[PDB]
Amino acid sequence: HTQDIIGGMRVDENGDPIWQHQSLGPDGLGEVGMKVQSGQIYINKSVPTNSADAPNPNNVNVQTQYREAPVIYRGPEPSHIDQVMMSVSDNDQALIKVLL
Amino acid sequence: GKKSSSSTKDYLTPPHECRLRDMTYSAPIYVDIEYTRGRNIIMHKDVEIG
Amino acid sequence: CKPNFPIGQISENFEKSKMAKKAKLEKRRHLRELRMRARQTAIQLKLNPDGTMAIDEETMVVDRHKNASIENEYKEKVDENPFANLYNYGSYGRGSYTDPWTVEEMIKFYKALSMWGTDFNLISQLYPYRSRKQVKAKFVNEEKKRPILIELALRSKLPPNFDEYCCEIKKNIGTVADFNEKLIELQNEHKHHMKEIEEAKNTAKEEDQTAQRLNDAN
Amino acid sequence: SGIVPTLQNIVATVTLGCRLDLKTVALHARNAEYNPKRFAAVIMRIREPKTTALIFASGKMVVTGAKSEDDSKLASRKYARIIQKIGFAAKFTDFKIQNIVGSCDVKFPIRLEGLAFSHGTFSSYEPELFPGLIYRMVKPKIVLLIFVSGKIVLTGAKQREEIYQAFEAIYPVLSEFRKM
Amino acid sequence: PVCKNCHGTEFERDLSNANNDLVCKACGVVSEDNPIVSELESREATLNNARRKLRAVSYALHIPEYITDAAFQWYKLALANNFVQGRRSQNVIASCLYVACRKEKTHHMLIDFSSRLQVSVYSIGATFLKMVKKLHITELPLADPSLFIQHFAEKLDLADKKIKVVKDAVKLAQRMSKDWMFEGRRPAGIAGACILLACRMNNLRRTHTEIVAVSHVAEETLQQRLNEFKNTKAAKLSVQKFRENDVEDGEARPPSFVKNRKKECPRNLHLLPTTDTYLSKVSDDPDNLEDVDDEELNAHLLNEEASKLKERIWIGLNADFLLEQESKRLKQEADIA
Amino acid sequence: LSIDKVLKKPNRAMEYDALLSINVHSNNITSGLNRAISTGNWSLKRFKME
Ligand SMILES: [Zn+2]
């Protein structure tokens, strides 16, 4: 019973936007309308580390367990992102579909 | 497709609403069956199977 | 506009709900009248001119469904309304409705409780279609209901008002036989049949060893 | 509120080192109950002092159905007075007790879901099988069930003493929730 | 992880020049280039059968599959605690699946499991209690009845305006909550009464039977629930009129002490009467009992002339020892067979 | 095969209904058809052809 989270926007030196974070948005979904380059992830994705452990029936240590795994835009030429939608599949899992 | 009780046209997701959610555009198959429950035989209508 | 039952707008598809309710009241009333009435296939051959004394190949096997299909044709047909099958917590659990007790039964209840101390074995058959469980609860609920009328019974340690002499023998006139010796005499018959089949057992055993000893010689 | 918790029913069993025969002790009594395919022993039912005598085929016996502790005691030897009619030894030695049940009325409505969220790390309940909240206390290793009517029952205690100091210990967690 | 000259700990994978190397920001020495990408038997059998059974009932109950694999972990460790032996296999998976239903907090209530196996509800909840004590589930969420409303409306064949019929309901459901109607009562009971009142005040689809066909709770036990609601406080405001925008608390009157009113320094240690004072009342003679004698229990003895009267009735009802006898006589007959 | 596994019981013979275990076998038609269009290979049996 651990989800996947879309937290983002780490800061440094009075400024949130690092060179890799000019297009993350407040929600983690990279905001629609501006350009991207190599690097500069646009969907921030985090997965728990105890993916295959037995469920211990207690509530002791679940506060900080998310290792990062974003999705990077490769490519030889800077592009834009056209529109981003999210919805739910047949059985209830959140979907993320952004169109470049 | 349609039932034999309500006799409405259909209750359905549109296909373009379906083709971007990774679902299958489907309508259920309905049969009617009769059998021996017990003391007597009964018939049942509009059974979902697929 | 009281919150119980206004008939006040469109109310789509209520008719299938309607006659289901009128049928469930009809079903329970036929359960009342079961209570009111209860109170009160070898093998076949033939003789051909061509081959006489020939046996039928189809009668050699049996179908095992034609006999079942006859009665299944002669059962009542009904159309299932998916509203009728409704189920709650009171479903598939043992226990039923007890037929409430009458004062005519109490004179057969007080006196059967006056004669013995409290003996639930033989008073069960006195109420022929009542069972051992709910009559034990009839002893329990009367402790709170009539605590003082029961308290006269255990003080009574004597033969009571001599009117049980009929009910002494009304119990006895069912299957009049000397039960203190009726059970003895047929039990002795049963062990006699078991002794005879035990005689048939060993006499079958001794001839069998005798016969195959002769096969061991040859 | 200095209320007094009353005690509704005991249990008590004693050993009997004499072998019992079901034919010679049930068929010539007054409280005769023996259906062998229903139950393999006999129940005596006397209503003074309103308790019940359960026996066994091997010989052992257990009494249940008294309010007071000594109330069970005086009948426990009257029960063995019937087995003094038949020529049996009736060797009862240890009048041990392992269950005493008690109910009370504290008479004010309470919340129940707050301590199911606060003190949920040890005790819990469900509404849909039974309407009551089961409460556990491991300090005497006791179980007890509470209500929303303010009536609280105590069961599962071997010793009569052990219901008492448990019963005031559960009050400060009970009056915690004044439904502000 | 540690560089060879400046001993840095951070390595940054540069991917712009199709090399995909490993190098630190501090000095610039590569770490590694040329990356290497990768292009009992009966114990196993008894859970493979148990896998398909969880696969079975999840299909029929429209369970989303991320509960089924999670519920397999519960059965796997409860297998180790010797809980499955003796009990019914078709029962023990139903209680096992229902735990993972309430950790996920779904709409699936318990009796829907009891329906298709055609057994009693109280049997399935019995082993649910006897399980949940044994393997020590401490944390477990409450069955909030707010879940059940918005799942009922889809099968309730109501009009197109299916969002307004549940928005007003959850206002009624939060009004249901702070008032004292459900504390020891049933979740499916009170969650079926709130949708009853919201449906009638806009439609007339409620027949006291269609919502029963959904909620599976009987008809007469919900008739009390609106009469419970009617005479508590300020409900006469909301019987006939008054658009549903009141924010009040009112009186707090659960009926469980209303029935009780219809009937009518801490404690020091040695004020209660003890238990050893009653142990020393009657002397504990192990062989003797002739100090607690009486006269009526001394008269407690058979009717001597009504003995053969009574056992003739007792032998006239009994046949259990009869067939026991020839079966006991069969124990000797099978010895030579 | 799910019917006679239930009907091999002495007490379970009078008021049993068989329709409540049709939903467990329902989706075998669906998940068969969906992979039959997704992965373009058809495992027939009456011809045994691939
Ligand atoms: Zn370095």
Swiss-Prot record, chain A:
Protein family (similarity comment): Belongs to the RNA polymerase beta chain family.
Record's protein name: DNA-directed RNA polymerase III subunit RPC2
Further facts: Present with 1950 molecules/cell in log phase SD medium.
Annotated compartments: Nucleus
Biological role stated in the UniProt entry: DNA-dependent RNA polymerase catalyzes the transcription of DNA into RNA using the four ribonucleoside triphosphates as substrates. Second largest core component of RNA polymerase III which synthesizes small RNAs, such as 5S rRNA and tRNAs. Proposed to contribute to the polymerase catalytic activity and forms the polymerase active center together with the largest subunit. Pol III is composed of mobile elements and RPC2 is part of the core element with the central large cleft and probably a clamp element that moves to open and close the cleft.
Summary of subunit composition and partner proteins: Component of the RNA polymerase III (Pol III) complex consisting of 17 subunits.
Transmembrane segments: none
From Swiss-Prot, chain C:
Highest taxon in the source lineage: Eukaryota
Start and end residues of each SANT domain: 96-147
Family recorded in the similarity comment: Belongs to the TFC5 family.
Subunit organization: TFIIIB comprises the TATA-binding protein (TBP), the B-related factor (BRF) and the B'' component (BDP1). Interacts with TFC4.
Biased amino acid composition, Basic and acidic residues: 201-210
Region of the whole protein represented: 280 to 537 of 594
Protein name from the UniProt record: Transcription factor TFIIIB component B''
Native species: Saccharomyces cerevisiae (strain ATCC 204508 / S288c) (Baker's yeast)
Subcellular location: Nucleus
Region of interest (Disordered), residue spans: 201-218
UniProt function note: General activator of RNA polymerase III transcription.
Curated annotation (Swiss-Prot), chain D:
Swiss-Prot/TrEMBL keywords: DNA-binding, Nucleus, Repeat, Transcription
Intracellular or extracellular location(s): Nucleus
Gene Ontology annotations for the cellular component aspect, listed alphabetically: nucleoplasm; nucleus; protein-containing complex; transcription factor TFIIA complex; transcription factor TFIID complex; transcription factor TFIIIB complex; transcription regulator complex
A molecular function (GO) term: RNA polymerase I general transcription initiation factor binding
Sequence repeats: 7-83, 97-174
GO biological process: DNA-templated transcription initiation; negative regulation of DNA-templated transcription; nucleolar large rRNA transcription by RNA polymerase I; positive regulation of transcription by RNA polymerase II; regulation of transcription by RNA polymerase III; RNA polymerase I preinitiation complex assembly; RNA polymerase II preinitiation complex assembly; RNA polymerase III preinitiation complex assembly
Keyword Transferase in record: no
Family designation: Belongs to the TBP family.
Oligomeric form and interacting partners: Binds DNA as monomer. The 1.2 MDa TFIID complex is composed of TATA binding protein (TBP) and the 14 TBP-associated factors. One copy of each TAF1, TAF2, TAF3, TAF7, TAF8, TAF11, TAF13, two copies of each TAF4, TAF5, TAF6, TAF9, TAF10, TAF12, and three copies of TAF14. Interacts with TFC8.
Protein name as annotated: TATA-box-binding protein
Organism from which the protein derives: Saccharomyces cerevisiae (strain ATCC 204508 / S288c)
Gene designation per UniProt: SPT15
From Swiss-Prot, chain E:
Subcellular location: Nucleus
Principal location: nucleus
Zinc finger (TFIIB-type): 1-32
Sequence repeats: 57-133, 152-231
GO terms of molecular function: DNA binding; RNA polymerase III core binding; RNA polymerase III general transcription initiation factor activity; RNA polymerase III type 3 promoter sequence-specific DNA binding; TBP-class protein binding; TFIIIC-class transcription factor complex binding; zinc ion binding
Residues given in the record as Zn(2+) binding sites: 3, 6, 24, 27
Keyword Repeat among record annotations: yes
Note: Present with 4330 molecules/cell in log phase SD medium.
Subunit structure: TFIIIB comprises the TATA-binding protein (TBP), the B-related factor (BRF) and the B' component (TFC5).
Its biological purpose: General activator of RNA polymerase III transcription. Interacts with TBP. Binds to Pol III subunit C34 and to the TAU135 component of TFIIIC.
Protein known as: Transcription factor IIIB 70 kDa subunit
The species this protein was found in: Saccharomyces cerevisiae (strain ATCC 204508 / S288c) (Baker's yeast)
Gene responsible for this protein: BRF1
